[PDB]
Ligand binder design. Structure first.
Ligand SMILES: *[C@@H]1O[C@H](CO)[C@@H](O[C@@H]2O[C@H](CO)[C@@H](O[C@@H]3O[C@H](CO[C@H]4O[C@H](CO)[C@@H](O)[C@H](O)[C@@H]4O)[C@@H](O)[C@H](O[C@H]4O[C@H](CO)[C@@H](O[C@@H]5O[C@H](CO)[C@@H](O)[C@H](O)[C@H]5NC(C)=O)[C@H](O)[C@@H]4O[C@@H]4O[C@H](CO)[C@@H](O[C@@H]5O[C@H](CO)[C@H](O)[C@H](O)[C@H]5O)[C@H](O)[C@H]4NC(C)=O)[C@@H]3O)[C@H](O)[C@H]2NC(C)=O)[C@H](O)[C@H]1NC(C)=O
Ligand SMILES: *[C@@H]1O[C@H](CO)[C@@H](O[C@@H]2O[C@H](CO)[C@@H](O[C@@H]3O[C@H](CO[C@H]4O[C@H](CO)[C@@H](O)[C@H](O)[C@@H]4O)[C@@H](O)[C@H](O[C@H]4O[C@H](CO)[C@@H](O[C@@H]5O[C@H](CO)[C@@H](O)[C@H](O)[C@H]5NC(C)=O)[C@H](O)[C@@H]4O[C@@H]4O[C@H](CO)[C@@H](O[C@@H]5O[C@H](CO)[C@H](O)[C@H](O)[C@H]5O)[C@H](O)[C@H]4NC(C)=O)[C@@H]3O)[C@H](O)[C@H]2NC(C)=O)[C@H](O)[C@H]1NC(C)=O
Ligand SMILES: *[C@@H]1O[C@H](CO)[C@@H](O[C@@H]2O[C@H](CO)[C@@H](O)[C@H](O)[C@H]2NC(C)=O)[C@H](O)[C@H]1NC(C)=O
Ligand SMILES: *[C@@H]1O[C@H](CO)[C@@H](O[C@@H]2O[C@H](CO)[C@@H](O)[C@H](O)[C@H]2NC(C)=O)[C@H](O)[C@H]1NC(C)=O
Ligand SMILES: *[C@@H]1O[C@H](CO)[C@@H](O)[C@H](O)[C@H]1NC(C)=O
Ligand SMILES: *[C@@H]1O[C@H](CO)[C@@H](O)[C@H](O)[C@H]1NC(C)=O
Lengths: 144, 296, 153
C-alpha cells in the first residue's frame, strides 16, 4: 500500500544577453550605459547562464529596439522579424541562430528619430528541441 | 551543561533552559502527524530542483533516522547545511541523471521525478512516495540592462517668424453684456449708458490676463490725434467722474468698462473709441492694479 | 493614360505630356540639394504655428517617405491639404501640449519648439532638427471699428 500526493512547482530558467565590442565576441560590457557612433558596429550575443542542454537550441523568434526600458512601447524597430532578420538593411547579419546556445546578431548603430536620446534593446527567444524540430529557420522575400 | 547557553541549538528548535535540566525540543509549531504528512516545501532552481522536509517533523513522526531516495538510488538525502531545520536533496535539471524525465509540450517543458521516504532500508506498513515536478517556461521576456547613448552629427538652422495675436472689442447694449453691435455706426443719447467690453478671439491662455493700460476716445478714426479724452489713465479709471466704473480688469480675458455717453466740444460730430492693452502673466504679476488719489 | 489631360497633377508639379509617355515631374525650380536643405517656410498663426517643406524638395533629397516629428512624438506631420505641394504640421500655441515651451520677457513673449526630420524611424548619417520660434507681441494697438453719432439738445 502506497500514498501518492501530487506536488507542483513553478520555475524559471536563467537567460541573459551581452554586448560585445569585437567581431569575435570577446569582452562583455559592465557599465550601466555606453556611448557609440553610428559607424560603429554593434555586435550582440545571447547566452543561457544555466540549463545548457545540448538538445535545447536558441531561436530568435523576434528582436526589437525601444527608446525606453519599458518593453511595451508602440515605437518598435524590429531587427529580427518572426525568426528571420529584417530585409532592406544589408547591415543586419546573424552568424548563428538555432545552431546552439550562442546566438549572435550583428548590426551597426542607429538612433531613433525625434527627442529620443537613449536606445534600448529587447528580444524574445524560443528554446527549440533538436529531437523534433529542425530549429534552423529558412526564409526569403515576402508576399509581394 | 556542556554548552552554557542556548545559541548552540537551532533557532526553530526551542531551547529549554532550566537548573539541573537542559535540552532543546520542538513546540506546537511542528507537532502534529497528519498535517506533517501533508507538510513539505519545494524549490525549483535554474539548474537544480530541491525538495526538503523539516527534521523536527520527521522526528515527531517517529522517523528518528530519515532515508530519502529517488527513482535512482545513487541520489541520497542529506542535511540542508544552510538552515539546519530542513533536510533536502538535489537533482540536476536534465534527463538521464538521477532518473529524471522530460515532459514537454508546445507551451513549456516540465520535469518530473519521485521522492521515496522511509525510516529504514525496508518498508513494512506505509510506502509514501512524493511525486513532484517543476515547470520551466519555454518562452520568456529578456531585457538588456545597459542602455546606449549614440552620437550623431546634427545640423541646426535657426528660423524665426513674426506673429500677431487677435484682439477685438465689442459694444454691448445691456448691463449684462449680451448683444454686440454689427452696424458701422450707431446713434445714442447722453443719458444712455455706453457699456463696452474687450475680448481675445484667440490665444485664450488661462495665465494671460487682460489689463487696460490706458483707454481713450478720439473724434476721428486716426488714433494719433492730440485731442484725447482718457477714460482709463495708466491702469486706473479717471477720477472726478462717478459714471466711470469698471467691473472687471485683469481678472480674466473679459475686460469691461462702463461709462455713459459724451460728446466732444466743437464741430466734432462723431466720436471713436480706442484702447491700449497689456497681457499680464498670472504666474509672476498680481495683475490686479490698485490705486488712489494722486500727488495733490 | 488613366487621366486624359494634365489637370490631375499639381500646378507646381510640371506635367510631361507625350505620346506613349505620361507623368509629372519637378523642374529646376525645386531641384537642388544644399539650398533645398536651406529651403523652408514658416507661418505664425493666432492660435497655431505651422512649418512646412516642399514635398518635391523632399523627394529630390532622397526622402521618398517623409517623417516629421517634434519634441513630443504624439505630434506627426501630414499633407498640407490646401496647396498639395507642401507638407506641414501644426502645434497649438500654448505651453505643455506637443512639448512647446514659453519664453517670456518684458517686451513680448515667444514660443519655441523643435522639428525633427528623417527618412525613416532610425537615423544613420545626419540628424537635422529644425529649431523654430514665433514671437507674439505683448502690446498692440486695437481700434473699435464702429463709430458713434451721439445726440445732444
Ligand atoms: C503544457 O503543460 C503545462 C504543464 O506542464 C500546462 O499548464 C499546466 O496546466 C495544469 C492544469 O491546468 C496546471 O495545474 C493546475 O493548477 C491549478 C492551480 O493553478 C493556479 O494556482 C497555483 C497554486 O500554486 C499557481 O501556482 C498557478 O500559477 C495558478 O495560479 C490547480 O487548481 C489544478 O488542480 C486541479 O486539477 C488537478 C488535475 O486535474 C487535480 O488533481 C487531481 O484532483 C483529484 C480530485 O480529488 C484527485 O483525486 C487526483 O488525485 C488529483 N491528481 C491527478 C488527477 O493527477 C486537482 O485536484 C485540481 O482539481 C480541481 O481543481 C479546480 C481548481 O483548479 C477545482 O475547482 C473548484 O471546484 C469546486 C467544485 O468541485 C468549486 O466549483 C470551486 O469554485 C472551484 O474553484 C476543482 O474542485 C478540483 N477538483 C475537484 C474534484 O474538486 C491544476 O493542478 C498548471 O499550473 C499549468 N502550468 C503552469 C506553469 O501553470 C499547459 O496547459 C500545457 N499546454 C498544452 C497545450 O498542452
Ligand atoms: C525680448 O525678446 C525679444 C525676442 O523674443 C527680443 O527682440 C528680438 O531680438 C532679437 C535679437 O536682436 C531679434 O532677432 C534679430 O533679428 C535680426 C533681423 O531683424 C530684422 O530682420 C528680420 C528679417 O526677417 C525682420 O523680421 C525683423 O523684424 C527685423 O526687421 C537678425 O539680423 C539677428 O540675427 C543676428 O543675431 C543672431 C543672434 O546673435 C545671429 O545668430 C547667430 O549667428 C552666428 C553667426 O554666424 C551663428 O554662428 C549662430 O549659430 C547664430 N545663432 C545663435 C547665436 O543662436 C545672426 O547670425 C545675426 O548675427 C549678426 O546679425 C547682424 C545683423 O542682424 C549682422 O550685422 C552685419 O555685420 C556685418 C559684419 O559681420 C556688417 O557690418 C554688416 O553691415 C552688418 O549688417 C552680423 O554680421 C551678424 N553676425 C555675424 C557674425 O555676421 C537677430 O536674429 C528679434 O527680431 C527680436 N524680436 C522681434 C519680434 O523682432 C527683445 O529684445 C527682448 N527684450 C528684452 C528687454 O529682453
Ligand atoms: C504537542 O501537542 C500536545 C497536545 O497534547 C501538547 O501537549 C499540551 O501541552 C500544553 C502545554 O501548556 C498543555 O496545557 C496541554 O494539556 C497538553 N496536552 C494534553 C493533551 O495534555 C504539546 O505541548 C505539543 N508540543 C509538543 C512538543 O509535544
Ligand atoms: C536639375 O538640374 C539638372 C542639372 O544637370 C538638369 O539637367 C539639365 O537639363 C537641361 C535641360 O535642357 C540640360 O540642357 C542640361 O544638360 C542638364 N544638365 C546636365 C548636367 O546634363 C535638370 O533638368 C534639372 N531638373 C530636374 C528635375 O532634374
Ligand atoms: C509600459 O507601457 C505600457 C503602455 O505603454 C504601460 O501600460 C505600462 O504600465 C508601462 N510599464 C512600465 C514599467 O513603464
Ligand atoms: C494721424 O495723424 C497724424 C498726426 O495727427 C498723422 O501724422 C498721420 O498720418 C495720421 N494718420 C491717419 C491714418 O490719418
Amino acid at each position: 500500500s502506497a500514498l501518492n500526493i501530487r506536488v507542483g512547482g513553478t520555475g524559471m530558467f536563467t537567460v541573459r544577453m551581452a554586448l560585445f565590442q569585437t567581431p569575435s565576441y570577446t569582452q562583455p560590457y559592465q557599465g550601466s550605459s555606453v556611448t557609440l557612433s553610428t559607424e560603429a558596429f554593434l555586435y550582440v550575443g545571447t547566452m543561457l547562464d544555466g540549463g545548457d542542454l545540448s538538445r535545447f537550441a536558441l531561436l530568435m523568434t523576434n528582436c526589437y529596439a525601444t527608446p525606453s526600458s519599458n518593453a511595451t512601447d508602440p515605437l518598435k524597430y524590429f531587427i529580427i522579424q518572426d525568426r528571420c532578420p529584417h530585409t532592406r538593411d544589408s547591415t543586419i547579419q546573424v552568424v548563428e541562430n538555432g545552431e546552439s546556445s550562442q546566438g549572435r546578431f550583428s548590426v551597426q548603430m542607429f538612433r531613433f528619430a525625434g527627442n529620443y536620446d537613449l536606445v534600448y534593446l529587447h528580444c524574445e527567444v524560443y528554446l527549440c528541441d533538436t529531437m523534433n524540430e529542425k530549429c534552423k529557420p529558412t526564409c526569403s522575400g515576402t508576399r509581394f
